[PDB]
Amino acid sequence: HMNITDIREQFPILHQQVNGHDLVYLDSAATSQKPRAVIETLDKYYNQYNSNVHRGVHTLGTRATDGYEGAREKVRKFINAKSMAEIIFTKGTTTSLNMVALSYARANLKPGDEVVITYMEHHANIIPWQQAVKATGATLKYIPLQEDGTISLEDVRETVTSNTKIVAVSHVSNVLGTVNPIKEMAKIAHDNGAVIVVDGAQSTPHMKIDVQDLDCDFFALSSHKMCGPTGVGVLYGKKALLENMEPAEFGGEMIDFVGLYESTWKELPWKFEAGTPIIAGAIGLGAAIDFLEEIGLDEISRHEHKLAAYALERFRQLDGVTVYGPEERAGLVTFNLDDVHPHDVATVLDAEGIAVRAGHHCAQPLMKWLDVTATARASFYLYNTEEEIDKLVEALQKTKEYFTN
Amino acid sequence: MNITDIREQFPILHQQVNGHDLVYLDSAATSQKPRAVIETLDKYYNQYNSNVHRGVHTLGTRATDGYEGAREKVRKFINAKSMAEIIFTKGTTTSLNMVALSYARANLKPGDEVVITYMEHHANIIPWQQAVKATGATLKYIPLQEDGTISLEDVRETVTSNTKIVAVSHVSNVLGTVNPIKEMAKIAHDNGAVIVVDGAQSTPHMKIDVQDLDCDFFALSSHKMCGPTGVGVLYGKKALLENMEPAEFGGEMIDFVGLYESTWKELPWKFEAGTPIIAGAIGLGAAIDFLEEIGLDEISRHEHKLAAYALERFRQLDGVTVYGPEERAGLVTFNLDDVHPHDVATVLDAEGIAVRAGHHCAQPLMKWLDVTATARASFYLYNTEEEIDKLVEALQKTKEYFTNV
Amino acid sequence: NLDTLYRQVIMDHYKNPRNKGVLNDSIVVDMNNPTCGDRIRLTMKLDGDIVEDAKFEGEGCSISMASASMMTQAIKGKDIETALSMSKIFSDMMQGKEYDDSIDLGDIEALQGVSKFPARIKCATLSWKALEKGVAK
Amino acid sequence: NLDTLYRQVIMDHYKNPRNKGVLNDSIVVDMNNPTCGDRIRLTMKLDGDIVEDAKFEGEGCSISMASASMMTQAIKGKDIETALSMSKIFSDMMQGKEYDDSIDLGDIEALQGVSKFPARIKCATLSWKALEKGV
Ligand SMILES: *Cc1c(COP(=O)(O)O)cnc(C)c1O
Ligand SMILES: *Cc1c(COP(=O)(O)O)cnc(C)c1O
Ligand SMILES: [Zn+2]
Ligand SMILES: [Zn+2]
């Protein structure tokens, strides 16, 4: 399987020093780095065939259009959507989720209805619902969490009722590392006459996504977390639902006929793509998909499980470190050192060239659920090694000793 | 900087298409990029890609300083008073939609009017259509003079005390007209209305000063001004932005997130939800530096000279009707009698020449001109008189080709 | 030149179109070419499962209008969802692939040429796209 | 090393802060570090044109808390003009800049070290930002 040496060789950003130490990048959950395959995809686009897409009759226009639509097809296959009509390019998971809230939620919520979310949700998958319920007179409800930060199926069945129209849930928590039971949740949503909206920004880079097997109604993901360019992402939605949603934005490219006062929309998926699209980013997202598929997502998953187990074990041998979340997890650990603020922790680590995140990780309610003000988080991806976990743990030990002499 | 030096910076220009030198005359659809911008993207992904803002490691600092330094370059570029007034968006279409969603829908009641023009691009039509429909307001059209310019008298006739919004393109992408924006802003203000300027076609080609223009909103797209795709700017007067709700919700645009309620970040981040367009915005900044080093007044002088040379050469060819007035920006929209512009563009592309054919996202304009489609060559800083000659010789070949049948 | 993949017969259908006009008591589709500027208003009056008359009006390039003309004439009297089979064959023909050749497919085929000039595929497919939406339930 | 950031005086103000509390009839502003974890509530009672007392309550990292302590103490009895001048000097000090050493900062100068750790600028600046909004 994965030869970590050969994998790392393809990411130029990894081969540099920070404060006279080799960079130890453990912040992939905030954003991922890019292989040469992707950056060269951007280069070749701008060097050889940049042009507008679709409305066009010249040679470079054809190449640019074939690239953009070919990337759509790669995304469809990547997440196993039935049809290209169901894949929409957006600016990111945030925009994607907002599109569902603006076009779907505001047309299918009346008073008495419920949107059901989770305590562990990223802000992206909280605030749109907050705004949507307030616009429609509906109600926001939270599925409780178990001790270990996982969700039980019973608590979903208890929280979801016949009044629920929407359940929104992250596939993988970016703080707790939990893999939520999305398939089973989709079934409970369907049994109560609701749709399910899946925030997959944290699952899609690290595990295989099959939207048909998941039977999720909407699925959102961000290119920048999966070795892709910044500024692009995907909204998947079942075709039948997209057919009856109005566009979230209006302008060129998404229209068919424009009169002075009224207009008709293009067919799916172009219905939802107003204006000159994210041409190079979408092509580069397609190149990131090719790269990840050649390695294999099951292989990426196995690598991260091995790093997560190794990290956990080494962290239990460290006294005075609390890790949050369950045993079985994705490739991240959020933690605190007792009596050392996480800003101090991150400063010491960055002085040893180690990059982690400190703060609330865009999950403030989760922080309050954990009874913590802030946390530190190391996250792993296909280019991280056991050696880097050793550096992290040794730096945490130095941090401990440094503040308590 | 001579024209040869300038072309030297754009690798896409130095290639063959159908055995001919590329003759790219479609800058009004999208612009090509200098080495300075592409290398900006390269260096971002090779050296300091990381999430921006709430940040603790070294590369995060460099990424954030790059993103915010690009904001400052945009502010100075368009002479906005304050960074608070510069918002990074996906493009002009998004920008215009944000104004329609957050401003128009909070300031329109029955009886109120939104005033646009017949020459507007779709981006600056459909959002207004949707906004009037949602609020019970009325859309009104400023007529055009027979040569496709706007009269100040026609604006005064159309704008009334009931008008809340006037939306107008700075430069028509079809006619090449420069609309009297400054004087229009004054008439809008006199009638208790704000003005929204679609600046996608002016910003790449002439100096923008929003303080002298006194426009309330101004929208532009990076991809047309030698910048990366997927990024643009919304400028708005600080006092207006203060009282508009965000268009999108999620992380980065918040101060505090509780379960049911959240508070917004100060401007400009209020309007920037989610992981932002990090590499795109830094590369837009590099495009601005590149354009400033050449000088926008010089770019304008160059395009006026190409436009004059093109016009003079054009009617000394029989059988072409050109649309719009004599004094114009660096573009010509035209038709060859009895040859559909798709056929024109096919023959031109066979001689390596890239033009656009059909509507140009201005269907009402097409109907005003009594035409179903048009051809358009557009010029920019890297075009030459020689390429104009190639275009005209190819139009002659096109004529003679379709007469021999 | 290479441009003589604007065949003899194609230019004839552009010069002198076949079923130009409007049909009443009808299935009515209206379509624009995504590559903007070609408009069709395609009208089919059908006798159960067959198109007894098919007509169109539009404005557009030689290819789009000629393909509409050849289409309407090759689809006058057509039988079952064999019409859809013709469409799928046409789309394969544009992509360069070989097809199930000679289930009549009256005339057209000169549009084979636009397997080159891929920028014009949509120009030739407009009329056919209209048909496929015509029979969409 | 790290030793140029976590100076003795800084650690001392973190361990044993000077003006801990929230006090009375006053201007009270509370401020948060966008990089979550640092919260301050600054309390100042102003006597015409001079700050007779400043106190603070809060939680956060060493730098933010220590800077709050040092700041509150270095502003006792100073004028408003002097206090803003101190603040501008502090903000120059966080960047590379040369700054005017007229005007004693006492302990505050120990925070010079955070110029070499830009991710902590905001941690050191929080307390001062509180003052600038205070006026
Ligand atoms: C290009 C253009 C737009 C739309 O800009 P996008 O970058 O496509 O969103 C709007 N108005 C005018 C005049 C334009 O030229
Ligand atoms: C990163 C992330 C988001 C937000 O995605 P952007 O790409 O920043 O818009 C939402 N949800 C989860 C679970 C994430 O990890
Ligand atoms: Zn055509
Ligand atoms: Zn801090």
mmCIF file of N, CA, C and O and ligand atoms in Angstrom, chain A residues 341-344 347, chain B residues 56, chain D residues 33 35-39 59-65 119-120 122-124 126, ligand 4:
data_model
loop_
_atom_site.group_PDB
_atom_site.id
_atom_site.type_symbol
_atom_site.label_atom_id
_atom_site.label_comp_id
_atom_site.label_asym_id
_atom_site.label_seq_id
_atom_site.Cartn_x
_atom_site.Cartn_y
_atom_site.Cartn_z
ATOM 1 N N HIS A 341 -2.580 26.916 29.298
ATOM 2 C CA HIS A 341 -3.517 27.397 28.284
ATOM 3 C C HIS A 341 -3.100 26.911 26.874
ATOM 4 O O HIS A 341 -1.931 26.912 26.550
ATOM 5 N N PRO A 342 -4.053 26.513 26.030
ATOM 6 C CA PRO A 342 -3.662 26.041 24.657
ATOM 7 C C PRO A 342 -2.897 27.054 23.797
ATOM 8 O O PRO A 342 -2.182 26.644 22.867
ATOM 9 N N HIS A 343 -2.978 28.361 24.085
ATOM 10 C CA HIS A 343 -2.147 29.314 23.301
ATOM 11 C C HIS A 343 -0.666 29.091 23.605
ATOM 12 O O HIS A 343 0.163 29.086 22.667
ATOM 13 N N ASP A 344 -0.353 28.859 24.895
ATOM 14 C CA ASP A 344 0.990 28.508 25.309
ATOM 15 C C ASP A 344 1.461 27.207 24.693
ATOM 16 O O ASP A 344 2.620 27.101 24.269
ATOM 17 N N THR A 347 2.259 27.843 21.016
ATOM 18 C CA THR A 347 3.490 28.582 20.900
ATOM 19 C C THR A 347 4.717 27.637 21.040
ATOM 20 O O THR A 347 5.690 27.747 20.255
ATOM 21 N N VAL B 56 -2.141 30.326 14.900
ATOM 22 C CA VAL B 56 -1.188 30.121 15.980
ATOM 23 C C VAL B 56 0.125 29.586 15.427
ATOM 24 O O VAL B 56 1.160 29.638 16.103
ATOM 25 N N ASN D 33 -10.305 37.779 22.446
ATOM 26 C CA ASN D 33 -9.361 37.571 21.380
ATOM 27 C C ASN D 33 -10.088 36.769 20.322
ATOM 28 O O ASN D 33 -10.676 35.718 20.653
ATOM 29 N N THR D 35 -8.907 34.852 18.191
ATOM 30 C CA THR D 35 -8.373 33.507 18.388
ATOM 31 C C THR D 35 -8.765 33.126 19.807
ATOM 32 O O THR D 35 -8.090 33.411 20.754
ATOM 33 N N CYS D 36 -9.925 32.497 19.904
ATOM 34 C CA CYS D 36 -10.609 32.143 21.133
ATOM 35 C C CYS D 36 -9.729 31.610 22.271
ATOM 36 O O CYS D 36 -8.818 30.833 22.048
ATOM 37 N N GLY D 37 -10.042 32.041 23.485
ATOM 38 C CA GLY D 37 -9.381 31.579 24.697
ATOM 39 C C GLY D 37 -9.032 32.696 25.650
ATOM 40 O O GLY D 37 -8.723 32.458 26.804
ATOM 41 N N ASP D 38 -9.055 33.931 25.162
ATOM 42 C CA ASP D 38 -8.621 35.090 25.931
ATOM 43 C C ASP D 38 -9.771 36.021 26.126
ATOM 44 O O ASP D 38 -10.277 36.614 25.169
ATOM 45 N N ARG D 39 -10.181 36.186 27.366
ATOM 46 C CA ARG D 39 -11.292 37.104 27.701
ATOM 47 C C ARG D 39 -10.853 38.065 28.788
ATOM 48 O O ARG D 39 -10.235 37.680 29.762
ATOM 49 N N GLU D 59 -9.803 35.363 31.889
ATOM 50 C CA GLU D 59 -9.094 34.125 31.796
ATOM 51 C C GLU D 59 -8.417 34.129 30.452
ATOM 52 O O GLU D 59 -8.948 34.578 29.446
ATOM 53 N N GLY D 60 -7.235 33.548 30.441
ATOM 54 C CA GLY D 60 -6.583 33.241 29.245
ATOM 55 C C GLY D 60 -5.135 32.861 29.435
ATOM 56 O O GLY D 60 -4.737 32.480 30.566
ATOM 57 N N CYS D 61 -4.395 32.919 28.305
ATOM 58 C CA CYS D 61 -3.023 32.485 28.280
ATOM 59 C C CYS D 61 -2.168 33.412 29.108
ATOM 60 O O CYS D 61 -2.548 34.557 29.430
ATOM 61 N N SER D 62 -0.954 32.960 29.378
ATOM 62 C CA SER D 62 0.012 33.781 30.103
ATOM 63 C C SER D 62 0.218 35.183 29.623
ATOM 64 O O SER D 62 0.213 36.147 30.405
ATOM 65 N N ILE D 63 0.443 35.276 28.310
ATOM 66 C CA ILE D 63 0.691 36.596 27.698
ATOM 67 C C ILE D 63 -0.489 37.567 27.901
ATOM 68 O O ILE D 63 -0.246 38.686 28.281
ATOM 69 N N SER D 64 -1.733 37.136 27.662
ATOM 70 C CA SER D 64 -2.846 38.040 27.691
ATOM 71 C C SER D 64 -3.089 38.570 29.089
ATOM 72 O O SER D 64 -3.273 39.789 29.267
ATOM 73 N N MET D 65 -3.040 37.668 30.060
ATOM 74 C CA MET D 65 -3.290 37.981 31.457
ATOM 75 C C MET D 65 -2.194 38.823 32.076
ATOM 76 O O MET D 65 -2.468 39.767 32.822
ATOM 77 N N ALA D 119 2.032 35.302 16.505
ATOM 78 C CA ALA D 119 0.717 34.684 16.784
ATOM 79 C C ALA D 119 0.212 35.104 18.196
ATOM 80 O O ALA D 119 -0.941 34.871 18.549
ATOM 81 N N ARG D 120 1.096 35.686 18.993
ATOM 82 C CA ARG D 120 0.709 36.139 20.343
ATOM 83 C C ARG D 120 0.510 37.658 20.469
ATOM 84 O O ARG D 120 0.199 38.127 21.589
ATOM 85 N N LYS D 122 -1.879 39.514 19.377
ATOM 86 C CA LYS D 122 -3.267 39.756 19.819
ATOM 87 C C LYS D 122 -3.491 39.387 21.283
ATOM 88 O O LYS D 122 -4.244 40.068 21.966
ATOM 89 N N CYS D 123 -2.741 38.408 21.752
ATOM 90 C CA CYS D 123 -2.791 37.992 23.146
ATOM 91 C C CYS D 123 -2.256 39.139 24.019
ATOM 92 O O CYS D 123 -2.805 39.439 25.077
ATOM 93 N N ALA D 124 -1.179 39.801 23.551
ATOM 94 C CA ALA D 124 -0.613 40.894 24.327
ATOM 95 C C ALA D 124 -1.429 42.154 24.155
ATOM 96 O O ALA D 124 -1.387 43.023 24.990
ATOM 97 N N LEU D 126 -4.789 42.508 23.560
ATOM 98 C CA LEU D 126 -6.174 42.502 24.038
ATOM 99 C C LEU D 126 -6.406 43.566 25.110
ATOM 100 O O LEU D 126 -7.280 44.440 24.940
HETATM 101 ZN ZN ZN E 4 -3.861 34.146 24.089
#
